[PDB]
C-alpha cells in the first residue's frame, strides 16, 4: 500500500527535477489516514522548493525517507523567493522517518555560487509549520544552505536517531531551531553544525534535549532573545546527558539589550565539554549582526540551574553577563568541574555581572562572584515580562 514516488513520475536520477512527482505522491498520501509515502533506498531525487500542505490531509501520514533528496544548485532551478526548501505545514501526527538523507548541497550558497545575489537568511532545509504531533527520526540532513531543521508553531515534537552534518566553518548552519513551539523531546541525536547545534527561540516551552552529541558547532543556546526591542518568552527547558566537542559554547543563553519578557526554569545537567571556549554563558549584551548599545529593558533571566557539568575550556569558563537594569536571579550551580585546556585559559576567571544565585557545591574553578542577596531591581520590572502563557 506504500506510495513510492517512482510510481508517481519521479525519475530518481539526481538530475531530472522530481518536485512535481513528489507533490503528486503527496496528494495521494494526503487523502489516506496512516498512509506511507516512500522515497526509496537506492535512488537520489532532485527536488526543489516544495510544501507538503495538509490542513485537509488526514492524520498519521508517514513520509518514509530511505533514499536521498538533493537540492538544486542554481538560482534558476531553485525558483521564486529563495524563501524555503522542504516544508510540511498544518499536519496532525506527521512522521518523517527512515535512514535516508536530505542533502542541501549548501556549499553553492556558502561559496556565493548560486548565480544570484543571495538573501541574508538562506533557506532552511526542512521546516515544520503549524503542526500537532511531529516526529522526525532516523534521517540525516547534510550541507544545509543555512538551518538544517526548524519547528515553528508546532506542538508535540519528537526528534530521535537524527543527524546533522555540515562543516564546522560553514556559515550560519545551525542544527535544530525551535520557535513558538512546545512539548518537544530531542534525543539520541548527533549534531555537527557551523552554528548553534540547537537553538531555542521565543515562544518555546517544555523542550527536553537528552543523549545528544554536539560538535562542531556553537553549542546549545536559548536565543538570541528580544532583538529589535521585542518580547521573548521561554520556559521549562531541560538539557541532560549531552556532550559538546570543540564547540564555541557549551550551554548558552543570549539576549539583546531592549528586549522584554522572560526566560525561566532552565536545567542544564550532565554536560561534558571538551576543548569548548565558553562552557557556561548567559549574555544579555548579545549583539552579533546588529548594534551593540544598551537599553533600559531586558529579557528577565531567572531560575537557571547547572548541575554536573565537567570538562575543559579555552576562554572564560563561566560568564554571567546580565542586564544592569534587570539582574539575573535564581542562578544555581552544583557539581561543576571545569579545567583549563591551556596555561592561558587557567588565568581566565569566572565573570559575573549583575548575577544573583547560589553555589550548592564548591566548584572548579571557584565561582566567587554570584550575589546571594535578592534583587529588588529585577523584581521591580515584572510588568515587562508578561509571558502569561508561560
Ligand atoms: C553596556 O553596559 C555594560 C554594563 O554596564 C557596559 O559594560 C561594563 O563596562 C564596565 C566599565 O567599562 C565594566 O566594568 C569594568 O571592568 C573592568 C574589567 O573588569 C574585568 O577584568 C578585571 C581584570 O581581570 C583580568 O585580570 C585579573 C587579575 O586581576 C584576572 O584574574 C582575570 O581573570 C582577568 O584576566 C577583573 O578584575 C574584573 O573582575 C571583577 O569584576 C567581575 C565582574 O563583576 C567579577 O566577576 C570579578 O569577581 C571581579 O569582581 C573583570 O573580570 C575593570 O577593570 C573596571 O574596574 C575599575 O573600575 C571600577 C569602577 O568602574 C572600580 O570599582 C574598580 O576598582 C576598577 O578601578 C570595571 O569594573 C564591566 O565589566 C562591563 N560589563 C560587561 C558585562 O561588559 C558596557 O560598556 C555598556 N556598553 C555601552 C555601549 O554603553
Ligand atoms: C513548567 O513546568 C512547571 C512544573 O510542571 C510548572 O510549574 C510551570 O508552570 C510550567 N511552565 C510552563 C508550562 O510554561
Amino acid at each position: 500500500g506504500t506510495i513510492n514516488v517512482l510510481d508517481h513520475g519521479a525519475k530518481g536520477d539526481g538530475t531530472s527535477d522530481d518536485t512535481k512527482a513528489f507533490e503528486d505522491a503527496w496528494q495521494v498520501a494526503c487523502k489516506v489516514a496512516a498512509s506511507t509515502l516512500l522515497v526509496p533506498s537506492g535512488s537520489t531525487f532532485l527536488v526543489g522548493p516544495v510544501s507538503f500542505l495538509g490542513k485537509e490531509c488526514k492524520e498519521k501520514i508517514v513520509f518514509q525517507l530511505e533514499g536521498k533528496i538533493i537540492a538544486p544548485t542554481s538560482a534558476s532551478a531553485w525558483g521564486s523567493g529563495l524563501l524555503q526548501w522542504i516544508e510540511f505545514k498544518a499536519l496532525q501526527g506527521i512522521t518523517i522517518k527512515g535512514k535516508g538523507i536530505i542533502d542541501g548541497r549548501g556549499s553553492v550558497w556558502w561559496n556565493d555560487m548560486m548565480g544570484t545575489k543571495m538573501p541574508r537568511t538562506k533557506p532552511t532545509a526542512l521546516r515544520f509549520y503549524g503542526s500537532n504531533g511531529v516526529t522526525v527520526s532516523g534521517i540525516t540532513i547534510q550541507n544545509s544552505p543555512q538551518t538544517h531543521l526548524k519547528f515553528d508553531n508546532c506542538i508535540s515534537i519528537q526528534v530521535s536517531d537524527f543527524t546533522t552534518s555540515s562543516p564546522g566553518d560553514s556559515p550560519n548552519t545551525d542544527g535544530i531551531h525551535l520557535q513558538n513551539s512546545q512539548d518537544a523531546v530531542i534525543y539520541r541525536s548527533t549534531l555537527a553544525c557551523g552554528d548553534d547545534c540547537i537553538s531555542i527561540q521565543t515562544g518555546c516551552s517544555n523542550i527536553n534535549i537528552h543523549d545528544v552529541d554536539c560538535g562542531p558547532g556553537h553549542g546549545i543556546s536559548i536565543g538570541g532573545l528580544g532583538k529589535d526591542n521585542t518580547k521573548a518568552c521561554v520556559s521549562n527547558i531541560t538539557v541532560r546527558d549531552v556532550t559538546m566537542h570543540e564547540t564555541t559554547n557549551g550551554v548558552r543563553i543570549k539576549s539583546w539589550q531592549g528586549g522584554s519578557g522572560s526566560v525561566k526554569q532552565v536545567m542544564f545537567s550532565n554536560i561534558q565539554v571538551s576543548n569548548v571556549a565558553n562552557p557556561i554563558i548567559i549574555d544579555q549584551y548579545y549583539c552579533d549582526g546588529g548594534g551593540c548599545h544598551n537599553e533600559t529593558s531586558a529579557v528577565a533571566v531567572s531560575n537557571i540551574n547547572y548541575i554536573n557539568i565537567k570538562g575543559t575550556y579555552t576562554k572564560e569558563p563561566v560568564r554571567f553577563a546580565c542586564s544592569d537594569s534587570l539582574p539575573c536571579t535564581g542562578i544555581s550551580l552544583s557539581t561543576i568541574e571545569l579545567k583549563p585546556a591551556t596555561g592561558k585559559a587557567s588565568s581566565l576567571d569566572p565573570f559575573c555581572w549583575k548575577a544573583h544565585g547560589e553555589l550548592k557545591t564548591k566548584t572548579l574553578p571557584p565561582i566567587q562572584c554570584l550575589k546571594t542577596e535578592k534583587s529588588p531591581e529585577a523584581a521591580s520590572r515584572s510588568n515587562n515580562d508578561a509571558c502569561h502563557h508561560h
Side-chain angles (χ1 to χ4, degrees):
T2 289
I3 302 152
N4 191 314
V5 294
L6 297 172
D7 293 312
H8 300 268
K11 299 278 156 214
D13 54 15
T15 51
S16 302
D17 172 28
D18 285 338
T19 312
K20 176 64 176 156
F22 276 57
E23 289 164 344
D24 288 343
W26 175 257
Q27 281 309 309
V28 179
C30 170
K31 297 164 192 287
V32 178
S35 63
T36 300
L37 183 162
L38 176 63
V39 181
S41 185
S43 308
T44 300
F45 301 87
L46 174 65
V47 179
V50 64
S51 293
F52 303 112
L53 299 169
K55 183 238 280 153
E56 79 277 32
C57 298
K58 306 300 172 185
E59 76 173 349
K60 288 151 190 173
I61 295 169
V62 177
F63 189 103
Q64 189 87 26
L65 174 56
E66 303 288 1
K68 181 154 70 184
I69 298 166
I70 64 176
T73 58
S74 69
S76 325
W78 266 79
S80 304
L82 304 186
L83 303 165
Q84 68 165 90
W85 186 20
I86 304 158
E87 292 211 344
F88 289 83
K89 298 182 72 181
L91 301 171
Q92 190 79 21
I94 178 67
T95 294
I96 283 64
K97 68 180 193 186
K99 296 310 293 184
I101 298 169
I102 294 171
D103 189 333
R105 306 205 276 179
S107 63
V108 72
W109 301 80
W110 313 329
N111 291 333
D112 193 25
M113 298 288 291
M114 276 276 315
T116 181
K117 177 58 201 248
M118 285 182 313
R120 193 129 316 270
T121 304
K122 293 153 195 77
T124 294
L126 176 58
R127 173 169 181 251
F128 292 87
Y129 185 85
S131 302
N132 196 321
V134 182
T135 298
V136 180
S137 69
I139 66 166
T140 296
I141 306 183
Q142 57 195 41
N143 313 308
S144 60
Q146 185 151 344
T147 305
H148 293 80
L149 172 59
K150 255 187 198 174
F151 298 95
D152 191 346
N153 274 263
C154 292
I155 181 139
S156 196
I157 297 156
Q158 297 204 324
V159 179
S160 65
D161 185 32
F162 171 75
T163 301
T164 66
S165 176
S166 291
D169 64 348
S170 57
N172 307 133
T173 48
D174 58 319
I176 304 173
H177 182 276
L178 300 104
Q179 194 170 270
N180 294 296
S181 297
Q182 298 96 36
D183 304 331
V185 63
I186 298 166
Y187 66 105
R188 287 177 54 216
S189 297
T190 305
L191 305 174
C193 300
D195 203 281
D196 281 323
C197 292
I198 304 174
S199 71
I200 299 168
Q201 306 305 334
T202 185
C204 290
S205 59
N206 191 21
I207 312 296
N208 184 354
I209 297 151
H210 66 89
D211 297 326
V212 170
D213 297 314
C214 166
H218 297 179
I220 290 174
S221 295
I222 297 168
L225 299 180
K227 191 181 178 176
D228 301 310
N229 308 312
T230 60
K231 183 174 297 312
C233 301
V234 177
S235 68
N236 287 354
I237 308 304
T238 298
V239 182
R240 186 193 73 241
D241 294 313
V242 175
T243 65
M244 284 96 190
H245 179 78
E246 302 212 320
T247 56
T248 59
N249 313 88
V251 287
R252 171 166 64 166
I253 300 174
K254 33 179 173 165
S255 76
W256 288 81
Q257 288 282 323
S260 71
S262 55
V263 47
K264 65 179 113 73
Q265 284 308 146
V266 178
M267 169 68 71
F268 298 121
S269 64
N270 287 15
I271 307 297
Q272 189 72 210
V273 297
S274 310
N275 211 26
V276 166
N278 280 293
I280 291 171
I281 173 158
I282 301 177
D283 183 8
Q284 303 206 275
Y285 302 85
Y286 177 78
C287 57
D288 185 340
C292 298
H293 52 271
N294 291 326
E295 308 272 4
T296 57
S297 181
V299 183
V301 177
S302 72
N303 294 349
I304 317 293
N305 305 275
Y306 302 87
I307 301 180
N308 192 22
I309 302 187
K310 303 193 183 167
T312 57
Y313 59 91
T314 68
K315 301 188 170 177
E316 287 164 333
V318 171
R319 177 165 183 94
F320 297 129
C322 304
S323 173
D324 283 342
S325 61
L326 210 173
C328 298
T329 60
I331 294 161
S332 174
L333 294 102
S334 166
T335 315
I336 308 299
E337 175 152 37
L338 294 169
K339 294 194 218 193
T342 62
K344 163 86 227 83
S346 73
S347 284
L348 303 176
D349 295 324
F351 179 92
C352 312
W353 182 265
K354 310 303 215 283
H356 301 243
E358 58 158 359
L359 289 200
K360 305 180 94 195
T361 67
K362 288 167 166 150
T363 62
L364 289 175
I367 303 164
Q368 306 156 45
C369 47
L370 275 180
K371 298 180 185 184
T372 49
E373 67 263 31
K374 171 262 190 173
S375 175
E377 282 73 22
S380 74
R381 318 301 308 280
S382 66
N383 279 261
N384 314 323
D385 176 0
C387 295
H388 308 113
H389 28 64
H390 286 63

